[PDB]
Amino acid sequence: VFPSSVYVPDEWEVSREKITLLRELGQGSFGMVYEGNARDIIKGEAETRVAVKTVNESASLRERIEFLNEASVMKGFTCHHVVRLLGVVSKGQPTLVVMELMAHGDLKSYLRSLRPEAENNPGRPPPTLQEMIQMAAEIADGMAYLNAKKFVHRNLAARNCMVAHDFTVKIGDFGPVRWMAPESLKDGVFTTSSDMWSFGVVLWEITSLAEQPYQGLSNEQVLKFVMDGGYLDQPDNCPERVTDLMRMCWQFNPNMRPTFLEIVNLLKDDLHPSFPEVSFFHSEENK
Numbered sequence: 621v622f623p624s625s626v627y628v629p630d631e632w633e634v635s636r637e638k639i640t641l642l643r644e645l646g647q648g649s650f651g652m653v654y655e656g657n658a659r660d661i662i663k664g665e666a667e668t669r670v671a672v673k674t675v676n677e678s679a680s681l682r683e684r685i686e687f688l689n690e691a692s693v694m695k696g697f698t699c700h701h702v703v704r705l706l707g708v709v710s711k712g713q714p715t716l717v718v719m720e721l722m723a724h725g726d727l728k729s730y731l732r733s734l735r736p737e738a739e740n741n742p743g744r745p746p747p748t749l750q751e752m753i754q755m756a757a758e759i760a761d762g763m764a765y766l767n768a769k770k771f772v773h774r775n776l777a778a779r780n781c782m783v784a785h786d787f788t789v790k791i792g793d794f795g796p797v798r799w800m801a802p803e804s805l806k807d808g809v810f811t812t813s814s815d816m817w818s819f820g821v822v823l824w825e826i827t828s829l830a831e832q833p834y835q836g837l838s839n840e841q842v843l844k845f846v847m848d849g850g851y852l853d854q855p856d857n858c859p860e861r862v863t864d865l866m867r868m869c870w871q872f873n874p875n876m877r878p879t880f881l882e883i884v885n886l887l888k889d890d891l892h893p894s895f896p897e898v899s900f901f902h903s904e905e906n907k
Contacts, residue, residue, distance in 0.1 A: 623685050627692040627710060634661060634707035649793060650687045651676040658718060661707050670706055673717040691717045700898040701762030702791045703782055722782035730783045731830040749859045752826055755789045757887045762791035764880035765900040767812045774810045776818035778825040798833040802847045803874055813874035820869025827862055828855035
């Protein structure tokens with residue numbers, strides 16, 4: 621077994637010289653991710669802020685190929701609520717995969733920065749109900765898109781959601797006992813329905829400002845607790861509407877949980893005016 625390189629140097633190929641790296645953003649599944657700038661990568665803008673993925677130096681040839689193969693797959697995604705591919709540098713080493721930059725980082729980090737005791741509090745109040753409903757809809761929309769494209773996330777969590785410069789939340793990377801559905805923990809079965817369970821946990825993270833799920837329980841205890849039918853307690857003074865969403869996501873029977881499109885449908889009337897203009901839900905592709 622050995623993967624063939626499916627990436628085709630096409631319109632997505634970007635000359636290395638157009639990419640300038642500024643700083644490290646953190647380790648990605650394949651290697652260090654950097655914040656950078658790209659010259660003339662998007663029609664209409666002289667330079668674009670970007671995130672640049674690289675592959676570990678210790679990576680095998682096979683892994684380097686898998687890295688590029690994932691980039692090729694991303695050429696087919698065009699959702700506003702899923703972090704998008706902008707370009708690829710496959711000529712020579714190191715291989716670079718250029719993505720749109722999410723200036724505010726992962727959702728977990730962002731949430732924890734809004735905590736009152738946060739040493740890096742931006743001086744802004746925690747998410748309002750309105751902002752939470754908006755985040756829920758954006759995340760659900762991105763997930764609905766992946767589901768339409770026939771992809772199961774398997775790792776949805778606040779740490780894997782990203783926040784843009786205008787605070788739009790998007791699905792980040794994807795191919796964690798505290799985020800897994802009981803059926804997944806029991807039979808290793810992953811579906812869009814188990815993704816829904818994880819979505820509920822993300823809502824819980826949003827309403828608790830990223831507290832650790834089931835804090836106090838070992839991974840061992842969580843495994844039994846969840847498979848026994850137990851679920852997370854509602855965070856203090858959690859908005860009733862978000863609590864209702866969580867409860868739907870945590871139905872023991874996966875068949876009883878809502879779909880991501882149904883989540884967006886439930887929230888559609890309470891979103892920013894721009895939502896219908898950018899969502900998968902309101903696009904002609906949602907059929």
